[PDB]
């Protein structure tokens, strides 16, 4: 379903090897929204249920549509909430490999959080996927301070938010197939590249 709090609920004595932190789009439900569940089920198939913890960004992140217009594409409160989850993962499970993702406002949130994150923690994020990245043009398809090889952006032709606008057109709502195949495929490949088998 749309709410997963595996990191918050998880036991430090039995940490998963992989922790996925994901931010939903504006007005979406739970803490995973429309795309998160599809990615989650595929990660679970590859690493097994006890092998991966799925954590959505909830709490202070209310995914308010109007916040897309703020300087960083989301609110300060939301960034602090996502930063807190990365810090929680790092303290709770020091040896877990992290992966991240975000859709629309959540993609701006993921980018802002990763930019502000302490380098020692940021460097543990093996891969990040962004769908309908609202700061795609502004950041030239990159996440500041984060390697291009660990980044995968899914920006549909005709998705105006990828070209510097805040208009929501039909292509912005067409990332379903990407969340079902290429996105988890990329995340799995990036985790295996560093963890092996």
Curated annotation (Swiss-Prot):
It is found in: Secreted. The active site is at 104 (nucleophile), 159, 172 (proton donor/acceptor). Gene3D superfamilies: alpha/beta hydrolase. The record marks 26, 105 as: Transition state stabilizer. Optimum temperature is below 30 degrees Celsius. Optimum temperature is 30-40 degrees Celsius. May have promising applications in chemical and textile industries as it is capable of hydrolyzing a variety of substrates including soluble esters and insoluble triglycerides. Can hydrolyze and thus modulate the surface properties of synthetic fibers such as the plastic poly(ethylene terephthalate) (PET), or the textile fibers polyamide 6,6, polyester and acrylic. GO terms for cellular component: extracellular region. Keywords: Disulfide bond, Glycoprotein, Hydrolase, Secreted, Serine esterase, Signal, Virulence. One of its GO terms (biological process) is carbohydrate catabolic process. It catalyses: cutin + H2O = cutin monomers. Disulfide bonds join 15-93, 155-162. GO terms for molecular function: cutinase activity. The keyword Heme does not apply. Inhibited by n-undecyl phosphonate (C11Y4). Inhibited by paraoxon. Changing residue 166 to A: Increases activity on p-nitrophenyl butyrate, poly(ethylene terephthalate) (PET) and polyamide 6,6. InterPro entries: AB_hydrolase_fold (IPR029058), Cutinase/axe (IPR000675), CUTINASE_1 (IPR043580), CUTINASE_2 (IPR043579), Cutinase_monf (IPR011150). Its main location: secreted. The 2 disulfide bonds play a critical role in holding the catalytic residues in juxta-position; reduction of the disulfide bridges results in the complete inactivation of the enzyme. O-glycosylated; contains one mole each of mannose, arabinose, N-acetylglucosamine, and glucuronic acid. Optimum pH is 8. Its EC number is 3.1.1.74. Coiled coil: none annotated. Catalyzes the hydrolysis of complex carboxylic polyesters found in the cell wall of plants. Degrades cutin, a macromolecule that forms the structure of the plant cuticle. Allows pathogenic fungi to penetrate through the cuticular barrier into the host plant during the initial stage of fungal infection. Belongs to the cutinase family. PANTHER family: CUTINASE 1-RELATED, CUTINASE 2-RELATED. This is Cutinase 1. It comes from Fusarium vanettenii.
């Amino acid at each position: 379903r749309t709410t997963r709090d595996d990191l918050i609920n998880g036991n430090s004595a039995s940490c998963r090897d992989v922790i996925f932190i994901y931010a939903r789009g504006s007005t979406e439900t739970g803490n995973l929204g429309t795309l998160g569940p599809s990615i989650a089920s595929n990660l679970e198939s590859a690493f097994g249920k006890d092998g991966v913890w799925i954590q959505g960004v909830g709490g202070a992140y209310r995914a308010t549509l109007g916040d897309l217009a703020l300087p960083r594409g989301t609110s300060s409160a939301a960034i602090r909430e996502m930063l807190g989850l990365f810090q929680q993962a790092n303290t709770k499970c020091p040896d877990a490999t992290l992966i991240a993702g975000g859709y629309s406002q959540g993609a701006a949130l993921a980018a802002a959080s990763i930019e502000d994150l302490d380098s020692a923690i940021r460097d543990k994020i093996a891969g990040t996927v962004l769908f309908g990245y609202t700061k795609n043009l502004q950041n030239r398809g990159r996440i500041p301070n984060y390697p291009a090889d660990r980044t995968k952006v899914f920006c549909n032709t005709g998705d105006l938010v990828c070209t510097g606008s805040l208009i929501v057109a039909a292509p912005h709502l067409a990332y379903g197939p990407d969340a079902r195949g290429p996105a988890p495929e990329f995340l799995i490949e990036k985790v295996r590249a560093v963890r092996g088998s």
